[PDB]
Amino acid sequence: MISKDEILEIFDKYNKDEITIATLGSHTSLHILKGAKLEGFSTVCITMKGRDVPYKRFKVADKFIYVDNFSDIKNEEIQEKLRELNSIVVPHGSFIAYCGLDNVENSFLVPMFGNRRILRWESERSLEGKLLREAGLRVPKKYESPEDIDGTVIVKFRGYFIASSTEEFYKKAEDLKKRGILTDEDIANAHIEEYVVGTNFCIHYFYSPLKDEVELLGMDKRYESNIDGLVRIPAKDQLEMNINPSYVITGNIPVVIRESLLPQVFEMGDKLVAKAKELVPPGMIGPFCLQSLCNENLELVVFEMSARVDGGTNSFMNGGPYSFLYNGEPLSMGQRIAREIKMALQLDMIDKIIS
Amino acid sequence: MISKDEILEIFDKYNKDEITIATLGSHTSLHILKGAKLEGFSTVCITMKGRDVPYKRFKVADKFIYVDNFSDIKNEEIQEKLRELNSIVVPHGSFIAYCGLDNVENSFLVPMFGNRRILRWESERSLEGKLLREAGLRVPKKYESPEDIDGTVIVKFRGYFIASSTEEFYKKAEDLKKRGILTDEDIANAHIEEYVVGTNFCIHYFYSPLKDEVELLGMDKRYESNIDGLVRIPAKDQLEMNINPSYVITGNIPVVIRESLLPQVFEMGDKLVAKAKELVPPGMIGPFCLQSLCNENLELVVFEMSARVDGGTNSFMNGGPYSFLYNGEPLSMGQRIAREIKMALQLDMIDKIIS
Amino acid sequence: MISKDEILEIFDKYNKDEITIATLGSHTSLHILKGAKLEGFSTVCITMKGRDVPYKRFKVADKFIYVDNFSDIKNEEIQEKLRELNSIVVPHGSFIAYCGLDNVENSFLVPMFGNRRILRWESERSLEGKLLREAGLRVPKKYESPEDIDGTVIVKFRGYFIASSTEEFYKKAEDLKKRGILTDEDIANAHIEEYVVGTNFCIHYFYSPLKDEVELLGMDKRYESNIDGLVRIPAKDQLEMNINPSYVITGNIPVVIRESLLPQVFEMGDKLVAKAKELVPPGMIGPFCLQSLCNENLELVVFEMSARVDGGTNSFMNGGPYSFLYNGEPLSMGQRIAREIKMALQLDMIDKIIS
Amino acid sequence: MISKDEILEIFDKYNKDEITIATLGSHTSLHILKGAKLEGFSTVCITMKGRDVPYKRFKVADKFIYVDNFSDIKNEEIQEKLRELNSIVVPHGSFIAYCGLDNVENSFLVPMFGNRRILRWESERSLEGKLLREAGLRVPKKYESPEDIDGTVIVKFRGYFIASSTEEFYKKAEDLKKRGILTDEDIANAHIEEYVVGTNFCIHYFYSPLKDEVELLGMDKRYESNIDGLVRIPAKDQLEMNINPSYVITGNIPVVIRESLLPQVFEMGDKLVAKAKELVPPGMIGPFCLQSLCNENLELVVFEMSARVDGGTNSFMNGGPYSFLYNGEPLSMGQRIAREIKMALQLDMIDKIIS
Amino acid sequence: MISKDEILEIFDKYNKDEITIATLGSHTSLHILKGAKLEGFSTVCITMKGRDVPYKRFKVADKFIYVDNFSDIKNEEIQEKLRELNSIVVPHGSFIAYCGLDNVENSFLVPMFGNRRILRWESERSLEGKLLREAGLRVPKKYESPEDIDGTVIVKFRGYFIASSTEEFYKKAEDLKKRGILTDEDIANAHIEEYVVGTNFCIHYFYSPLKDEVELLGMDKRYESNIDGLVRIPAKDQLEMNINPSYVITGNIPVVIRESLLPQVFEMGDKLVAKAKELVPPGMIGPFCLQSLCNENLELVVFEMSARVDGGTNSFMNGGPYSFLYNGEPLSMGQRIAREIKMALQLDMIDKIIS
Ligand SMILES: Nc1ncnc2c1ncn2[C@@H]1O[C@H](COP(=O)(O)OP(=O)(O)O)[C@@H](O)[C@H]1O
Ligand SMILES: Nc1ncnc2c1ncn2[C@@H]1O[C@H](COP(=O)(O)OP(=O)(O)O)[C@@H](O)[C@H]1O
Ligand SMILES: Nc1ncnc2c1ncn2[C@@H]1O[C@H](COP(=O)(O)OP(=O)(O)O)[C@@H](O)[C@H]1O
Ligand SMILES: Nc1ncnc2c1ncn2[C@@H]1O[C@H](COP(=O)(O)OP(=O)(O)O)[C@@H](O)[C@H]1O
Ligand SMILES: Nc1ncnc2c1ncn2[C@@H]1O[C@H](COP(=O)(O)OP(=O)(O)O)[C@@H](O)[C@H]1O
Ligand SMILES: NC(=O)c1ncn([C@@H]2O[C@H](COP(=O)(O)O)[C@@H](O)[C@H]2O)c1NC=O
Ligand SMILES: NC(=O)c1ncn([C@@H]2O[C@H](COP(=O)(O)O)[C@@H](O)[C@H]2O)c1NC=O
Ligand SMILES: NC(=O)c1ncn([C@@H]2O[C@H](COP(=O)(O)O)[C@@H](O)[C@H]2O)c1NC=O
Numbered sequence A, B, C, D, E: 001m002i003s004k005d006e007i008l009e010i011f012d013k014y015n016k017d018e019i020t021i022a023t024l025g026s027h028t029s030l031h032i033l034k035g036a037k038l039e040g041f042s043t044v045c046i047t048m049k050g051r052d053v054p055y056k057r058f059k060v061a062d063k064f065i066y067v068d069n070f071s072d073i074k075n076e077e078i079q080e081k082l083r084e085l086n087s088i089v090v091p092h093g094s095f096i097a098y099c100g101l102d103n104v105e106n107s108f109l110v111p112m113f114g115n116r117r118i119l120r121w122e123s124e125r126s127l128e129g130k131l132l133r134e135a136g137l138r139v140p141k142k143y144e145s146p147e148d149i150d151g152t153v154i155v156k157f158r159g160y161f162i163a164s165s166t167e168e169f170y171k172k173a174e175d176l177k178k179r180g181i182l183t184d185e186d187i188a189n190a191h192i193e194e195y196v197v198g199t200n201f202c203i204h205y206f207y208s209p210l211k212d213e214v215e216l217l218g219m220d221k222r223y224e225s226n227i228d229g230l231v232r233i234p235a236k237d238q239l240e241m242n243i244n245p246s247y248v249i250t251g252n253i254p255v256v257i258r259e260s261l262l263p264q265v266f267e268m269g270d271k272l273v274a275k276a277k278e279l280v281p282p283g284m285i286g287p288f289c290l291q292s293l294c295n296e297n298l299e300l301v302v303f304e305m306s307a308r309v310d311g312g313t314n315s316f317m318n319g320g321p322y323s324f325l326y327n328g329e330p331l332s333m334g335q336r337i338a339r340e341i342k343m344a345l346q347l348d349m350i351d352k353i354i355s
């Protein structure tokens, strides 16, 4: 429901000499907050007892807003403190979850960097797939039912698994059932897709509304448990084990793509951005991620996407190979975001970047 | 054919107050170009429609020379524009390929950073092997024919494969034949070598003719498709698949060697450089790479080498652990190259570094 | 035996205007030395013929103390040169080994950064396990004998191996016996523990006595041979091989943890530090490492620890994502150590950091 | 005559990927050019034999356009080279003079940073005085004729002189006549004004059209010959001399104002800018200078002004006390100008800053 | 009256995770505030309508506390806002004046950087002279009455004047009387001292309680009106004028002393600091200034001193020749102060630096 005009009129009651930057103490905040500081902003970190330390030892947050549980960040109490601090909020991962995405779309009355509406088109696999499909991006083939399985597939609902046949599907579905990890409910709605075999590049872009431009900021590959520990076990020993792959994100590892694939990489960000404009105006605002896999035909296949800032950006908080190129600075995505805010304020174009 | 005296006399007609740096928009250019800019140079990027974007959004090239296809970079038209811009060319990967290595050795009349002649000793496995062998470097054992196969071997001609027996060789050779990936022609000339099992360090060195010194700039490990995606599949599931490993370079990942192996690492660069002096004078000039594997006996075995700048340097465009040590700067290899140029110009020693 | 008062009285005869920083040319020294230089210190590198080059080409050491073999660093001759240079020694890895840990605890009369006593609690698996256990840290389950083996286990004594049964244990123990890699002596004392399956984070902390605070400096994952080369071989091909995993450290790869796990990460450093205070006063001083594995339940399990600086810090000599956050500098662990020294000298608190 | 639309249509035929920055090798160019380089621009310096060295040894210009005499910079030949290089021209001091201000206002068909029209309102004392007067700025009292002289006055036409009476006026007018320094022509048009006695602050501002804001960049005091050498002679000795003060600008000396006078300083820039908008639209664009004198009542009296960049900015090419405050950078005025250009290009607002 | 224990107990109720730095928008604040920001602090500027602009355009203050008149900064309302923001106050010049020094010594209940008590020993010429005299510093000779005048003297009470005889004294005293500038009241209390003829060095020191050390930060020479404008008038013309010298501080100019005089310069800071310890414990804390004159015998004579930060530090907000030497940074005095605060907080030694 949340209107833009409704948000622009909250921002107007804002002391424009004292715009702070706020976000939740988790996910990507360290460099969101550090990046604000580096751009001259004072930073507000929503945190809680037990989860505050890293924001305290990294000296990255000027003001803390402590909650009892991160769940409370939907409360009017917290929204008020945030408005009283003239904070623009930088959403992420974790913020959407603890706040709840409905609360974010119509209950969270705090100005927010980026296109609010577009946060749903990422929460929903149908919307996400629509966008990537309509944008004209390579996605893994979808499979309506386990009977369609005609190659290796991955099956999504931690409870992930791999299958090369309909038979293998239920064999495994059953396994994860008789072990409590999967309920017949999840198994019914199971999303089955082509298992793309290749190299992982989670590619972090920044669309600048001010500059009307898609920028490449960086790239990481996921570091997942247990899978990445599983495959570090020799095949002989893996076969002697009764173990299921899990794919819990635990970290990220820096990587750079082959330079001749940047034209492809940029086109992918352009296309996505150009279609998101039509489907969810104003479209992709600020940071977004294409989580892709490079098959052996040097084709990047997008198996997931983020419409906010993605966790992999943590791999370059001190800047990386790509973010450096612009101005030879240790530029993080957090800071890149802070700059857009800064510059928008300075050109009186805050309406191009908040919602 | 291209003479040095012939090149020095092209460079003389050059406005020495306006030396630019040129290269082709691909492979390693981003930091070749950015590194020039950082050293005060104005940069020329040879590019083409559709492949130009990343050099435009990274603001890394002052002048573009657009071609219809990168193939045209052999044309006299392009050579002239380059000479008229007082450009020293920085070769790479991609440049050799689109230009063609014959054209580079006797048809490309533009001054070029590094030892021109030595670019062949990298194109040819016989020369390369000679050099590494004569330099005194550990290389994987070669195998004349599939009958000699007495361990695990890798077989080179994308169409790579692994074999642990003569039988397995043809079994697989056939596989890649009946699937169009390999023609009996490639299979006949198949290069078979010891499969070295260990950790990948692509080690980037810089020989400075001015300083007469081998420098360590950085290290990456290859990120290859589909192999690195293949091995991320659990053994159980891999066995249920009918899939062949491919080894297409798609990216690079930063790594540092165990410090006690740097003496070995430096000796390897010294030896290579000292033998390349005798075999292909003036020898290794500027950037070169030993693509090695560290076996469990902490011995680095070189399975490949580059005599120009290697793609892995992209892993440290914002500088890395090793390039930092010299002056605490975010030093890339591109910039290290620009500096040599700069300094050579300033000491009037351009003849120690171009050809 | 070495007393603190005994060490403080060596340091007093020191020219406090000329404190140098010394360490051994290996392990982590490059950034220990570079970090000293960056903090204004003059640096002393103990080296030897053939192992000196990298410290010479990296221009990181002001004075070399050449030995015939690194073994000699216990000699009174070397201790004297070091005292005459007013050097505080920064221990590491390699230093403990060549010097010998007994020699370090009671024969090495040179001031040393960090808690001397605590270097043993890392050399001994019983002490180490006590500390991690008492600190309240997750460790892999221990197994008294091969008969207790009831899951996958790893077995430690290069000569490492994996087992999923008592039968498999001896099958493999025998293998490594009949191949000379393992003697019945090692096999008897074999340490058997739960094979933790997950993502490797070697987490580098710095306890500051001055600031009384645990800082997070960085993280790497080990790059080991042959294992990490072994698992890069396709399962089908691995099965056709007769090859044993080895786990020789050859390098390190940068990684960042999922941000929501930093509270856990910091608590682990706090707990360790708080227990080391009681067990080995003054406790953990300066750099220490928890070498952990993140299981799929996002629990970090510590399978090893260093009480001095760990080799992985080499992954961020030009600084990393975490070290950056403090002051936006390319901060290495070597430099972080130099700073503590510097600052201790300046506040006249050298007794909080040497021993 | 020169139209804006006329200029915007020259700029359109410009390759927007290759905008260079050009100016004349003199006056303030060193930091105009260096500041461009630092912002990523390639720089064009118009120079001539004998006057080129400092731009060559400072490595500040990528391309030189040599003229026979700086006078030629009006020629169509030079305008074409400049248009072909996609150069935006940055006017100064010296450029106006050698080019001639008429040629600049209607004959110089090269895009130019800042408000073209406003360059006249600085060439003419009547316009200048109007502006400062209408802006509401303190100026020294004007004196119609030598008979009005009722205090100390300075008299302007090198040929300057000071008078405290009508009698003294002609006494001195005669002196400079019978010595050839002044012709009866100059003496007739002599401008006579109140001699303001106080401290010199030449205050360099930057109006940003993008940010719609007046910024304080720096301050210098003039270093003039012979006056500043004259007054360094003891009074006793000066009286024994027959010497006339001259006021030839030879250099500049850095100074900072008393902080409590910055509100006054900023108001002066605001007022000037706000009136220049009405009188000469778009008004003051970019760099301008109020050359003032602080009387003992802490009132700043403007005795001169520049509507382009003023020579004093040379006092802070490595940045100064005020330019630092914004981002802690060594920010020069040249660079501040380059940034505006850069940013205007990036927001597609080149029409707010060229003419 | 204000107690330390009384202040330490205000600071305890402070959120130690959110210490801000506050001061008054004037005098030296720009670099006090900027220096805080650079050290990670969030900054509070007390300002008022009309005087706020420079702190707004320099983006140097995160939070403004607007007053109706700077006088109000004594109000409990303002003290509360400041305590609620966890602000340590950095006194200066302007702050003492608007707040009133009595209010500062016993009515201003906000923690304050430096030794509170010592602010009086600077307000009073008797205390100041005692300190400089007892410290063992060269001061100009004092003159009890105009009859003692036996050389050139300067006479202090804007209303300053110079005299070389008793006769000249009253001649001039009368002049400034019959012109309203001096009342018989001021003339009675007139302070008469030796006119020291030499070069002005206002020398800015920083005593660090943490480091127990006097540091040299920088040096400026005063730029005063009308005197410095007066002496720029030729002697002949000055004699034709009826003008009185005034000495209103309007600005500052950077200068460096002859290096061989630094031993003297440092001794002067040591002595002052060592005597201030005895006379006003804890003594000189943080920034202080010796405003001296170098006579021709290379002896520095202190004619004034500041016990807080002096306005001349504005001459090096981007750092200067001396502040650079420590760490090669553009270190201002504001930042040097912020660092002491930072570091004191980090070593839990806030009691060594506040009062
Ligand atoms: N189509 C696919 N082919 C191969 N691996 C995949 C595919 N989709 C996902 N994965 C692996 O499983 C992990 C979880 O996938 P997914 O849940 O889609 O990403 P996320 O949970 O981060 O949105 C991915 O990081 C990737 O490594
Ligand atoms: N002797 C070998 N042992 C194991 N792996 C190898 C060997 N040679 C090559 N490889 C793997 O195959 C990839 C392709 O090898 P190669 O074609 O020699 O390198 P490039 O194509 O980059 O010159 C390498 O990056 C390496 O990972
Ligand atoms: N409990 C475990 N589970 C899985 N892998 C392990 C375990 N312990 C060690 N390893 C692997 O074997 C390597 C050697 O382990 P260890 O010898 O304990 O470390 P280090 O030799 O560096 O002290 C580790 O780097 C890790 O990759
Ligand atoms: N009204 C004045 N009172 C005192 N000095 C002045 C006055 N006007 C000019 N001067 C001095 O003479 C010099 C030349 O003045 P002017 O010619 O107006 O400046 P410019 O030539 O730089 O435009 C100035 O730099 C200043 O030092
Ligand atoms: N003893 C002296 N000899 C010569 N000049 C002096 C002397 N004392 C002060 N002055 C000049 O007069 C100015 C005002 O002096 P004073 O009022 O003592 O300093 P402040 O007002 O800054 O405390 C000084 O900046 C200096 O230039
Ligand atoms: N790559 C990362 O480091 C990363 N960390 C967290 N996420 C995502 O962030 C969301 C919330 O993060 P968390 O559980 O740490 O609060 C999760 O749905 C997870 O998919 C990540 N992935 C993408 O944002
Ligand atoms: N490591 C890398 O990122 C990398 N990228 C490209 N190359 C080599 O560069 C040559 C040309 O590169 P490309 O196909 O991107 O134009 C290829 O033969 C490839 O082996 C690479 N390897 C070595 O130069
Ligand atoms: N991770 C690393 O790069 C690393 N390099 C060396 N070490 C340890 O350092 C010790 C001595 O090192 P070296 O063998 O290079 O002299 C060894 O016991 C080894 O376990 C390492 N691991 C931990 O310190």
Ligand SMILES: NC(=O)c1ncn([C@@H]2O[C@H](COP(=O)(O)O)[C@@H](O)[C@H]2O)c1NC=O
Pocket: D026, D027, D093, D094, D097, D249, D250, D251, D252, D306, D309, D310, D311, D312, D314
């Ligand atoms: N302050 C300076 O260094 C300075 N240098 C040159 N100017 C002005 O510049 C004009 C041209 O300079 P020049 O003679 O160096 O080419 C002159 O009218 C002179 O008044 C200066 N003053 C203002 O622009």
Ligand SMILES: NC(=O)c1ncn([C@@H]2O[C@H](COP(=O)(O)O)[C@@H](O)[C@H]2O)c1NC=O
Pocket: D257, D258, D259, D260, D261, E026, E027, E093, E094, E097, E249, E250, E251, E252, E306, E309, E310, E311, E312, E314
């Ligand atoms: N040197 C300077 O720039 C300077 N500016 C101001 N002061 C002193 O500061 C006090 C208050 O300053 P103000 O009048 O700008 O608010 C005055 O007594 C003046 O002597 C200065 N001198 C010493 O602090």
Ligand SMILES: [Cl-]
Pocket: A203, A204, A205, A287, A288, A289, A306, A308, A309, A310, A313, A333
């Ligand atoms: Cl992102």
Ligand SMILES: [Cl-]
Pocket: B203, B204, B205, B287, B288, B289, B306, B308, B309, B310, B313, B333
């Ligand atoms: Cl290379």
Ligand SMILES: [Cl-]
Pocket: C203, C204, C205, C287, C288, C289, C306, C308, C309, C310, C313, C333
């Ligand atoms: Cl460590």
Ligand SMILES: [Cl-]
Pocket: D203, D204, D205, D287, D288, D289, D306, D308, D309, D310, D313, D333
């Ligand atoms: Cl200006």
Ligand SMILES: [Cl-]
Pocket: E203, E204, E205, E287, E288, E289, E306, E308, E309, E310, E313, E333
């Ligand atoms: Cl001071």
